[PDB]
């Protein structure tokens, strides 16, 4: 219910990846599925995700963060990759099952 639904917002501010300007999806570790997903991202969505990351890294080399104002907000975080990735993992399970079969 609305329990872990406010916990989530807590955890989200706890992680702090928004202090760098990264969407929750910019932090996913790039395994095989994630990699495929990212190749399916539309030109612009990919170029934006890139800048966000190339900027976060530059922050990390400098040992700074974004001025409080620019921080991503729990509700304004676009899960731009989540759906693609879901499909990639979907297509995959099909194959996997179809081959033992």
């Amino acid at each position: 219910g609305r329990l872990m639904d406010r916990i989530r917002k807590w955890y989200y501010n706890a992680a702090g990846f928004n202090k760098y300007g990264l969407m929750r999806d910019d932090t996913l570790y790039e395994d095989d599925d994630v990699k495929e997903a990212l190749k399916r991202l539309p030109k612009d969505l990919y170029n934006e995700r890139m800048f966000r990351i190339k900027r976060a890294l530059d922050l990390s080399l400098k040992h700074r963060i974004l001025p409080k104002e620019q921080w991503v907000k729990y509700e304004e975080d676009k899960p731009y990759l989540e759906p693609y990735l879901k499909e990639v993992i979907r297509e995959r399970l099909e194959r996997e099952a179809w081959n033992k079969k």
């Binding site: 190749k39 399916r40 539309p42 297509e91 099909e94 194959r95 179809w98």
Partner: protein, 421 residues
Amino acid sequence: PGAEDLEITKLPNGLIIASLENFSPASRIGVFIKAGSRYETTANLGTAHLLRLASPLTTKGASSFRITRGIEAVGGSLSVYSTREKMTYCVECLRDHVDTVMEYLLNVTTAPEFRPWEVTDLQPQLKVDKAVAFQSPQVGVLENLHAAAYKTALANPLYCPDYRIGKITSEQLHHFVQNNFTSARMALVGIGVKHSDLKQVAEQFLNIRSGAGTSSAKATYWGGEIREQNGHSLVHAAVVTEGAAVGSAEANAFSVLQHVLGAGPLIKRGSSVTSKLYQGVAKATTQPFDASAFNVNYSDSGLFGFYTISQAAHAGEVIRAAMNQLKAAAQGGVTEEDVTKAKNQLKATYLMSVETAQGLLNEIGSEALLSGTHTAPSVVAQKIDSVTSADVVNAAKKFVSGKKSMAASGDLGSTPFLDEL
């Protein structure tokens, strides 16, 4: 159980259903459509070509993976043949798996998704597919012919032009499918199947609206001249003039004027004596060659003339001699007998071309889509011989008089220009 019979329902929306149980151990279902490279515009060129290769891509119901693994699992096959105005998606499996191979056939033609990535990962294949086909200079002069013979629609190339490789979008694919694969333009034929089933399916699974949607811009005639100097030692050439259209009773005249001048040998390594044109060219050149009667029948127009393959040097004499031999036939040079033999070669050719499941389903389909009917092989027999020694000599004139188009590729240095014949 002997020979049953060719039923052919004609549903509300305008979707035709032509079946025929012949009890072969194998079925061959096929969706014929009135789509093609002639509904293309300068803006979406080659979107027809790509749609032809995009047949194995994911659909709303089956995945790119499962479609191939699905059909392969039953020794099945999917294929897509197309002309400047007629696409033919069709499967073919063993009787017991018609249900299986159907799902995909239906899913492919009606529920395509054309996903951005799959689509753009596929566009490099246009580069290939077009390179292999273009190995036959035969298909090289035909492209340029239709270009010179028209100003629009049919003038559109059958293989995606180069500059447009990699610039086609998912929309162009979608929009071309939404505005052409309309139930009114679609016919779901089939062989080795009982009409009650082929029908049962067409109504329960086929959605897509009807009505021609977008209509092809009537093909204006041009009468061009495209020459392709390219070194290649053999000069291929095709000189033609507007012939007849799909159906016209004047076209059966050309089909007979075809076999009268010669339409490709019937005896391995033969000399084709029954071929006016061939014999005529022989009596002119000394070295190897080949020449024939070219005849194309399109919905709102047609083409007709000859085609020559000769050595670069004897291209002159071969092409000119190929003309005089067509004029001499326009001036009473046709025996009442040449017309009787040509009538048989034509009945034969037709009668044989329908022995192979593919050629048969393509006979039933084509007709059951351009009139929702079906002439008996007995009625078509009449139309053939109901051609007089006149009609022939007339078609021959219509050629010598009408404006001519021309296509040629090779070391054209010795080939003639249209304004010299």
